[PDB]
Coordinates of C-alpha atoms and ligand atoms in Angstrom, one line a residue:
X78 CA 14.8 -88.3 -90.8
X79 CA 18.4 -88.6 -92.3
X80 CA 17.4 -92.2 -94.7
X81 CA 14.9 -92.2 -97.2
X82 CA 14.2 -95.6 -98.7
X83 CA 16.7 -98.1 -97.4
X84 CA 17.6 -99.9 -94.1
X85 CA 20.8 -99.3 -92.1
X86 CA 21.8 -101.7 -89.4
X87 CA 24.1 -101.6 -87.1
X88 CA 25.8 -104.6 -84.8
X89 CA 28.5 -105.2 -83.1
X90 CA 32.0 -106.8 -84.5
X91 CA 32.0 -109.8 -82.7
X92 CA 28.0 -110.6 -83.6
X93 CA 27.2 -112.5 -86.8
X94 CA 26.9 -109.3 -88.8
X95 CA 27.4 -111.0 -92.1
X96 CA 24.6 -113.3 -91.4
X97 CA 22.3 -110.5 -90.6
X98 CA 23.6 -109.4 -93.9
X99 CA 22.0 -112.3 -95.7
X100 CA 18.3 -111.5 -94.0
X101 CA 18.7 -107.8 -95.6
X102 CA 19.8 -109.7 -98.9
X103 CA 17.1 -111.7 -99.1
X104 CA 14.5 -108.5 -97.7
X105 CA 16.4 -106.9 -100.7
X106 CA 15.2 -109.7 -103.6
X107 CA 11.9 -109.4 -101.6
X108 CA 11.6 -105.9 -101.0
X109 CA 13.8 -103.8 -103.2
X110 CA 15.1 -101.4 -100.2
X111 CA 19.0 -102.0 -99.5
X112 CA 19.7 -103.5 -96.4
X113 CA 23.2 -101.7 -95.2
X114 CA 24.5 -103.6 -92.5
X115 CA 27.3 -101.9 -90.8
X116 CA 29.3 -102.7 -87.3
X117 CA 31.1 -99.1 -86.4
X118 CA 33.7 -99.2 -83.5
X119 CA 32.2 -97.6 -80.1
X120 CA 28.8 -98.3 -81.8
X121 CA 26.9 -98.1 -78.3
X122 CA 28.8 -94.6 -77.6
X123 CA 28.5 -93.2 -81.1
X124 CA 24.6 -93.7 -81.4
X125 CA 23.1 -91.4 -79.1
X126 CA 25.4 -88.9 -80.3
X127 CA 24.3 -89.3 -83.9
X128 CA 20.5 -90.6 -83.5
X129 CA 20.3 -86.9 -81.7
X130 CA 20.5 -84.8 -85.0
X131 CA 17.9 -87.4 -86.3
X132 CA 20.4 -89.7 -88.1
X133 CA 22.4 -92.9 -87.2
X134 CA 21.0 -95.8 -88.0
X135 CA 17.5 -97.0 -88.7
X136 CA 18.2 -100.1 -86.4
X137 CA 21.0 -100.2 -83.5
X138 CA 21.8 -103.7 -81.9
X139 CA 23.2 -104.3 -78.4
X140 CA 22.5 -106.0 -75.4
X141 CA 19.1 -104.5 -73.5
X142 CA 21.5 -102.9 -70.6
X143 CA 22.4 -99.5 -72.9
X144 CA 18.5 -99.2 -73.9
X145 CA 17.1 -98.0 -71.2
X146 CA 19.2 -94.9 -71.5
X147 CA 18.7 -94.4 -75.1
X148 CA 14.6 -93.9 -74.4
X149 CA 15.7 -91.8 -71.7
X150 CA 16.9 -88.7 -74.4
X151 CA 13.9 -90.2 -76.6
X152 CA 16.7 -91.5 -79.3
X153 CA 14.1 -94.6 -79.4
X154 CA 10.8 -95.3 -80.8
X155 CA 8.0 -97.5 -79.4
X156 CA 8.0 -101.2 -81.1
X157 CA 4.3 -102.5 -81.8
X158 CA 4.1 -106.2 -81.2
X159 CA 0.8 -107.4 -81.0
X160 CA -0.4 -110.2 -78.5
X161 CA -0.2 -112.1 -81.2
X162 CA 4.0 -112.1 -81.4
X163 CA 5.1 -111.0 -78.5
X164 CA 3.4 -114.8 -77.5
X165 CA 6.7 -116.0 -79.5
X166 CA 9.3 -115.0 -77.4
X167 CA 9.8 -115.8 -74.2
X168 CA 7.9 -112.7 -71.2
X169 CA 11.3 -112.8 -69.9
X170 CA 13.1 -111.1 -72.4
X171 CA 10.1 -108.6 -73.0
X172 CA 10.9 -106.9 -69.4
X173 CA 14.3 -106.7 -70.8
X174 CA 13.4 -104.3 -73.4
X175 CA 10.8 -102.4 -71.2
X176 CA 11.0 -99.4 -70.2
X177 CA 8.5 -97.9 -67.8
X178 CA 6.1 -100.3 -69.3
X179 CA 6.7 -99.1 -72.6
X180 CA 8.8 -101.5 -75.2
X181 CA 11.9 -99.9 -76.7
X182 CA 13.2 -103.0 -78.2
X183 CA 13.1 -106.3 -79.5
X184 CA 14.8 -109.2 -77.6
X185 CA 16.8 -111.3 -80.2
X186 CA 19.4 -113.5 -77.7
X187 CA 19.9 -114.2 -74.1
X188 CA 23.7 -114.0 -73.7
X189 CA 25.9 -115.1 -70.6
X190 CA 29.4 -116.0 -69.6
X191 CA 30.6 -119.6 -69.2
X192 CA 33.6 -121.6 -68.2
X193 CA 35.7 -122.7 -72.1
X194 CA 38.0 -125.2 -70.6
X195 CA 40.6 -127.0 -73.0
X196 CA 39.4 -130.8 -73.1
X197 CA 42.9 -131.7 -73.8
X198 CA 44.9 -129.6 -71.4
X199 CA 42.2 -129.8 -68.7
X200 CA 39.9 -132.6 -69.0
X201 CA 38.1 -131.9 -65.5
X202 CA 37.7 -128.3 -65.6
X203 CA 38.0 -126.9 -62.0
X204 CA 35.1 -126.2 -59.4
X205 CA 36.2 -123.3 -57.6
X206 CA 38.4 -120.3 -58.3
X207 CA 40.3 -121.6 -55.6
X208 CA 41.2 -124.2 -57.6
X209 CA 43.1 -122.2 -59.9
X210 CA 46.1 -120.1 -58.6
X211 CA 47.6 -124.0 -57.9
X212 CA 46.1 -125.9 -61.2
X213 CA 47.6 -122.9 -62.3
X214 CA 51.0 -124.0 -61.0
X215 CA 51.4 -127.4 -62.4
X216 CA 50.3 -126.1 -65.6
X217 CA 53.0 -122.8 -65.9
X218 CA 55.3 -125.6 -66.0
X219 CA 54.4 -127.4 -69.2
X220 CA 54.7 -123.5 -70.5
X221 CA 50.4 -123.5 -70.4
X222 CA 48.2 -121.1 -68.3
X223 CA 45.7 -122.2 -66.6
X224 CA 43.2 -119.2 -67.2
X225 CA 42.8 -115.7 -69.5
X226 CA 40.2 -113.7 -70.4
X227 CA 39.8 -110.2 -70.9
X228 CA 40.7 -108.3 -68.2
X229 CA 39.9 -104.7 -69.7
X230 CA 36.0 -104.7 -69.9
X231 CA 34.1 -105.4 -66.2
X232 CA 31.5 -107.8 -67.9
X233 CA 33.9 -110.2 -67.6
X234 CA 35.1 -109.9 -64.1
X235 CA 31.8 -109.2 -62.6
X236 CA 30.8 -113.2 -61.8
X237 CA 33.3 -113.4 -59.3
X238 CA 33.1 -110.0 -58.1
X239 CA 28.7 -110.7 -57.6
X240 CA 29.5 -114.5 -56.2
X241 CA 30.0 -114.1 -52.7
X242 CA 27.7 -110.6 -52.8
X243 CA 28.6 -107.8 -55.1
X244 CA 26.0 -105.9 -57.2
X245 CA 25.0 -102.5 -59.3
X246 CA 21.6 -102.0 -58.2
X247 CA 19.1 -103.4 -55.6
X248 CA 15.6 -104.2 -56.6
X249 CA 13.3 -102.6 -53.8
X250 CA 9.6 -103.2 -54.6
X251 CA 8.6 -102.5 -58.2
X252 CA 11.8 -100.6 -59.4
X253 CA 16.0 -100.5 -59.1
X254 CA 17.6 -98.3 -56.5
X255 CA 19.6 -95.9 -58.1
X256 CA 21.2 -95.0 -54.6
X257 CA 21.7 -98.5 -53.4
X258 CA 24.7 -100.6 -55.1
X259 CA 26.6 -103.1 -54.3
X260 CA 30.4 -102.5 -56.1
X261 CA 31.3 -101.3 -52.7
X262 CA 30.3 -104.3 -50.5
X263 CA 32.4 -107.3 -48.3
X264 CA 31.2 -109.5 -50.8
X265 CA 32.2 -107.3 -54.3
X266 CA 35.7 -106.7 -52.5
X267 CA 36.2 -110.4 -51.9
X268 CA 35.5 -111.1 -55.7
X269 CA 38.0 -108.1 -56.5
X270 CA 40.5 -109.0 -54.2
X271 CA 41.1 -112.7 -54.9
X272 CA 41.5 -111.7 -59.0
X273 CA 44.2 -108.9 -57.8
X274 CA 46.0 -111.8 -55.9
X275 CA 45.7 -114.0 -58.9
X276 CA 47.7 -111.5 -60.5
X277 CA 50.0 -110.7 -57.8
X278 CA 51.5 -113.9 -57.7
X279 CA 51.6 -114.0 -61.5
X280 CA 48.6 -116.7 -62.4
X281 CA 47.8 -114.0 -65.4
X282 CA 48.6 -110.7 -66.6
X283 CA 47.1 -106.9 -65.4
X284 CA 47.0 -106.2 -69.5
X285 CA 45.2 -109.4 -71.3
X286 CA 42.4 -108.5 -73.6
X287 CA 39.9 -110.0 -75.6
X288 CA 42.1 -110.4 -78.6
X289 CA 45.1 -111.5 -75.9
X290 CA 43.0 -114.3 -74.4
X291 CA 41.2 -115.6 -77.6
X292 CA 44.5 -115.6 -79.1
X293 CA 45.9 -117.8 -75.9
X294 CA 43.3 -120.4 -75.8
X295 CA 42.8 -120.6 -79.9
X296 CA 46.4 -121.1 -79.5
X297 CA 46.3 -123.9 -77.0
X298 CA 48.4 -122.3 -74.6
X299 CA 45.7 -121.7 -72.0
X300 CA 43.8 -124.4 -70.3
X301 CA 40.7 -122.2 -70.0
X302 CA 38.9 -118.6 -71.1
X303 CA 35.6 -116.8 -70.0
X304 CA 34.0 -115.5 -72.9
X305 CA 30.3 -116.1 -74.6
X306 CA 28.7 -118.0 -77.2
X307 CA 29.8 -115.4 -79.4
X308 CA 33.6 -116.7 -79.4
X309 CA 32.9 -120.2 -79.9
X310 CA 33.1 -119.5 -84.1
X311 CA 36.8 -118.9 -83.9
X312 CA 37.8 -121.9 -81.7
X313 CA 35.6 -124.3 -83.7
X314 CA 38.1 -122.9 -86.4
X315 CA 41.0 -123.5 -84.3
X316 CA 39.4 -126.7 -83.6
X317 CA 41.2 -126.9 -80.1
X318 CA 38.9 -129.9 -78.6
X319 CA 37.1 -127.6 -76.1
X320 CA 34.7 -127.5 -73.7
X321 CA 31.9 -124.8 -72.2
X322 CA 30.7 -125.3 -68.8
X323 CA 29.5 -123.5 -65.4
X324 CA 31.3 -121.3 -64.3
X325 CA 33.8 -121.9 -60.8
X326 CA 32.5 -121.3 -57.6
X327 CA 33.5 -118.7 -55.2
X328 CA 33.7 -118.5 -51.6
X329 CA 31.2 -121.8 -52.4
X330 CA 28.6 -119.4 -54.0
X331 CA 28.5 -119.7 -57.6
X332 CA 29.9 -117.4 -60.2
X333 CA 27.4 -114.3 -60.9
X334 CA 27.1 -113.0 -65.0
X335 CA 25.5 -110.0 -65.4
X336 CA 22.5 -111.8 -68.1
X337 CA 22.4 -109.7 -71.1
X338 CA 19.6 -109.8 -74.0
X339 CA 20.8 -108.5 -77.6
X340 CA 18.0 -106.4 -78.7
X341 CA 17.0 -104.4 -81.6
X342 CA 16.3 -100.4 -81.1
X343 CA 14.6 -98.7 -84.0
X344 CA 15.9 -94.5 -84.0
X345 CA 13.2 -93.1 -83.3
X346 CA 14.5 -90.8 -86.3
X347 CA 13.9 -93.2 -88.7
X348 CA 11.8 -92.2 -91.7
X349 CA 11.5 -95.9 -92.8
X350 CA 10.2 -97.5 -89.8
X351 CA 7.8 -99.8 -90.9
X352 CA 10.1 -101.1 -93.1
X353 CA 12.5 -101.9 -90.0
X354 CA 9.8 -103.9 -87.7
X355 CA 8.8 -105.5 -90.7
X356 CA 12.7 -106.9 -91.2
X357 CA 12.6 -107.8 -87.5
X358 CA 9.1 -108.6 -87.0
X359 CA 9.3 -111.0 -89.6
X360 CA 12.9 -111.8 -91.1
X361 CA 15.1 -111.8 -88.7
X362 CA 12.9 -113.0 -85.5
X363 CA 12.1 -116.1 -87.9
X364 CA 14.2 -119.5 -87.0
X365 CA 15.0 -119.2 -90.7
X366 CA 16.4 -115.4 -90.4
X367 CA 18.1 -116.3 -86.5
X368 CA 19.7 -119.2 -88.0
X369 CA 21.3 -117.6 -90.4
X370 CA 23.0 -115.0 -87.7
X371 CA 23.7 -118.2 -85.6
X372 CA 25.9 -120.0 -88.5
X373 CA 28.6 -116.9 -88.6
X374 CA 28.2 -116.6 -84.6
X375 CA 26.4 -118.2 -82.0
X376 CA 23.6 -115.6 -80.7
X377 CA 23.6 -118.4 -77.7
X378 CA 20.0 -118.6 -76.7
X379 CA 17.1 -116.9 -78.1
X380 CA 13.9 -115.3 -77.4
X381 CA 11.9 -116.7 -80.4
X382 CA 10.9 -120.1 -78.9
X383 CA 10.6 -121.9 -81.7
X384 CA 14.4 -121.6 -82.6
X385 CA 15.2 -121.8 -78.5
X386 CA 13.9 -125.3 -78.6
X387 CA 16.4 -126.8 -81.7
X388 CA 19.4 -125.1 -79.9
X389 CA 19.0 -125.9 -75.9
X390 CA 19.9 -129.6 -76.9
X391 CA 23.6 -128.1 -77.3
X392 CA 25.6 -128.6 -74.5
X393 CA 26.6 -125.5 -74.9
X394 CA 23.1 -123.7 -74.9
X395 CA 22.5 -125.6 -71.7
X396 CA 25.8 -123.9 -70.0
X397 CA 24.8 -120.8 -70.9
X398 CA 21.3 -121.1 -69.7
X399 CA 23.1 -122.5 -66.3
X400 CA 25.4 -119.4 -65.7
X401 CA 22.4 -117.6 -66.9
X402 CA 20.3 -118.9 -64.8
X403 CA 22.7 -118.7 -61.5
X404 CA 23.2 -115.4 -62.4
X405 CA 20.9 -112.2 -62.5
X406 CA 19.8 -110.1 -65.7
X407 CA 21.0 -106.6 -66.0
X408 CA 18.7 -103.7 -66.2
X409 CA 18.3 -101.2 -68.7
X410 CA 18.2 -98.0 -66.4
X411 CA 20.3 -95.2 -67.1
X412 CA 22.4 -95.7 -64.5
X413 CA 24.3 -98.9 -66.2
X414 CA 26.3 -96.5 -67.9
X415 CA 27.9 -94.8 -65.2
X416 CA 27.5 -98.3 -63.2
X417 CA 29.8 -100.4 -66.0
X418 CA 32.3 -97.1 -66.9
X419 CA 32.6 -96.6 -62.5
X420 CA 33.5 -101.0 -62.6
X421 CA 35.4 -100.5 -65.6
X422 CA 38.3 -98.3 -63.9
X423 CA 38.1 -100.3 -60.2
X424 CA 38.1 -103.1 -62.0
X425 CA 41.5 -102.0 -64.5
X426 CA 43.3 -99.6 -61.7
X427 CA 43.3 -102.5 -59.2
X428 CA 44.8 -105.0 -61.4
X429 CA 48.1 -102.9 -62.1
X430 CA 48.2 -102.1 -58.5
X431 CA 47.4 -98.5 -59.7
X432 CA 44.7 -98.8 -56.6
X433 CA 43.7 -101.2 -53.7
X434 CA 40.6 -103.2 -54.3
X435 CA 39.3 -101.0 -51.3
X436 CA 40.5 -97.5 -53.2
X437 CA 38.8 -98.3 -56.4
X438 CA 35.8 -99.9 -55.2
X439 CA 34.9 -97.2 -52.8
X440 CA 35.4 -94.4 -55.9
X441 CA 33.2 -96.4 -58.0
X442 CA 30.5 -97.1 -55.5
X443 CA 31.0 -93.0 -54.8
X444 CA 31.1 -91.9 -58.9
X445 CA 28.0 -94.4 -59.4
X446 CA 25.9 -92.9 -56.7
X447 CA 27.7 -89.7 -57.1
Ligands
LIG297 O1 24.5 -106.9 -78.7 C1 25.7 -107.3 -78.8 C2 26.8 -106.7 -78.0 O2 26.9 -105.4 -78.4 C3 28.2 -107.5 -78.2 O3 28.5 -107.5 -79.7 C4 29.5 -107.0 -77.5 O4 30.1 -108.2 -76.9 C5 29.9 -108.7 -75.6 O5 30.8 -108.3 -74.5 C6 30.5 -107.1 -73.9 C7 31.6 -106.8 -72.9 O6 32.8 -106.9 -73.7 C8 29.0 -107.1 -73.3 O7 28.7 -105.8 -72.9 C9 28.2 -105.5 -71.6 O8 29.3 -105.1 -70.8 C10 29.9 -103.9 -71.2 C11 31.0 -103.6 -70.2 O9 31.8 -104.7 -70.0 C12 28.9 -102.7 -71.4 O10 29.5 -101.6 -71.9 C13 29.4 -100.4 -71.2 O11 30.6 -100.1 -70.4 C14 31.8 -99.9 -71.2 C15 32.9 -99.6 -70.1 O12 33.8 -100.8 -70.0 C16 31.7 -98.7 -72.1 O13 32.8 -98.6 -73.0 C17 30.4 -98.9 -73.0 O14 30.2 -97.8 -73.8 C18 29.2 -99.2 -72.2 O15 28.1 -99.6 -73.0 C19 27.7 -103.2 -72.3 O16 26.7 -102.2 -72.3 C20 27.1 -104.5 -71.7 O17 26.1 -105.0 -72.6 C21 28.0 -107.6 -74.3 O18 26.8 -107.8 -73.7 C22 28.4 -108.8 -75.1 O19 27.5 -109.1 -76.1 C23 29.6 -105.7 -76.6 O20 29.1 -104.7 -77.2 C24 31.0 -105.4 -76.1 O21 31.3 -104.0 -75.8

């Protein structure tokens, strides 16, 4: 068991984990148990390894990609909605969480990439990626960039790399190929090969990072950043007059995110697991207990469609659904492990030149389906 009488959470830093703090404080003067809400570095990697010896926490937090794996070495227990709830959130998001039919999770927040352009710097953001290495030009004159985002997780590089045909796995009647992906094919390399010739003619840097790139854009000094709903707490506090918006184009085929669902995984380990689909079930699924994680950082849309419907009139919310939308949801195999670590490398070793878009997307299409 490794608990008790109290409830652990565990989110990641850039999530609203100090409003999820407030739903245990108020479970706490309603409940008595100690809501701990905790956001550990390398959270996704670190679970499994814990929640093996029967420890962790009692909750874990993360987009529905990592929690098909997780059920895999049984590190998850079965969640019990009834008809009744499960009526609440959108079906969508339900698949998300399922695994083999079985639910391992509950869907809190749809999340996707969009286009933050600088209203100031860039009042008409650009259509097309093409647009850029030249809007790029006129701009590294004023001493602004035109783009920067972070370069060093895949996520954010795969909507151009899926735009004009890249993929992890195919969906062949009823279930995902594990042998069949698409980080190897004419249309991934086209995505790759365009960002590596960004780079190499200097219209962004091999290196940036999340903290790089939020630092450029809070800073004014790039036009525009790819990041989610989660980031738009710190510019609001920069203020920077910004804007969110669809994605650009590619090869005339529009940009690609991978759709992810931030979920909520009980360990199957947990010896106080009512206690922790009672805080979800009814707490934090609640507009009241989602609002409350949506004032420290935007969850961007949600699966409780109650709370879905007083957010999509943001402009915002309506971008994300767009990109979302134009884009494809991940699955929650095992596989999208080795599938994001495999993208991860091609994806890095490419940009310093270290390999050739070819080089490193033929050993990652060979390491996934190795
Ligand atoms: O539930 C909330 C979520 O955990 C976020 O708080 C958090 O932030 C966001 O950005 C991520 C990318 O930076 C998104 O993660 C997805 O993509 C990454 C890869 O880019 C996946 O991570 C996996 O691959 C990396 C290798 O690069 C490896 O280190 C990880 O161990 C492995 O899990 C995620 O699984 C995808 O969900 C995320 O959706 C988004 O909310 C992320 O946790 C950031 O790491």
């Amino acid at each position: 068991a490794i608990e008790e009488g109290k409830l652990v959470i565990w989110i990641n830093g850039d999530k609203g984990y100090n409003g999820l703090a407030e739903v245990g404080k108020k479970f706490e003067k309603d409940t008595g148990i100690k809501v701990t809400v905790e956001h550990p570095d390398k959270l996704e990697e670190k679970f499994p390894q814990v929640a093996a010896t029967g420890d962790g926490p009692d909750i874990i937090f993360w987009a529905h990609d990592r929690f098909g794996g997780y059920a895999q070495s049984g590190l998850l227990a079965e969640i019990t909605p009834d008809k009744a709830f499960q009526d609440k959130l959108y079906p969508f998001t339900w698949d998300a969480v399922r695994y083999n039919g079985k639910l391992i999770a509950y869907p809190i927040a749809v999340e996707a990439l969009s286009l933050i352009y600088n209203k100031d710097l860039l009042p008409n953001p650009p259509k097309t990626w093409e647009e850029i290495p030249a809007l790029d030009k006129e701009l590294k004159a004023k001493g602004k960039s035109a783009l920067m985002f972070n370069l060093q997780e895949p996520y954010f590089t795969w909507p151009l790399i899926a735009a004009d045909g890249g993929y992890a796995f195919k969906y062949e009647n009823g279930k995902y190929d594990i042998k069949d992906v698409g980080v190897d094919n004419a249309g991934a390399k086209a995505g790759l090969t365009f960002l590596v010739d960004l780079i190499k003619n200097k219209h962004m840097n091999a290196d940036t990072d999340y903290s790089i790139a939020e630092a450029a854009f809070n800073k004014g000094e790039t036009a525009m950043t790819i990041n989610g709903p989660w980031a738009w707490s710190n510019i609001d506090t920069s203020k920077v007059n910004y804007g969110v918006t669809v994605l650009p184009t590619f090869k005339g085929q529009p940009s690609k995110p991978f759709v992810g669902v931030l979920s909520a995984g009980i360990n199957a380990a947990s010896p106080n697991k009512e206690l922790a689909k009672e805080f979800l079930e009814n707490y934090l699924l609640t507009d009241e207990g989602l609002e409350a994680v949506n004032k420290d950082k935007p969850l961007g849309a949600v699966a409780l469609k109650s709370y879905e419907e007083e957010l999509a009139k943001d402009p915002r919310i309506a971008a994300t659904m767009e990109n979302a939308q134009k884009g494809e949801i991940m699955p929650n195999i095992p596989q999208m492990s080795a599938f994001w670590y495999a993208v991860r490398t091609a994806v890095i070793n490419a940009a310093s030149g270290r390999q050739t878009v070819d080089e490193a997307l033929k050993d990652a299409q060979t390491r996934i389906t190795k």
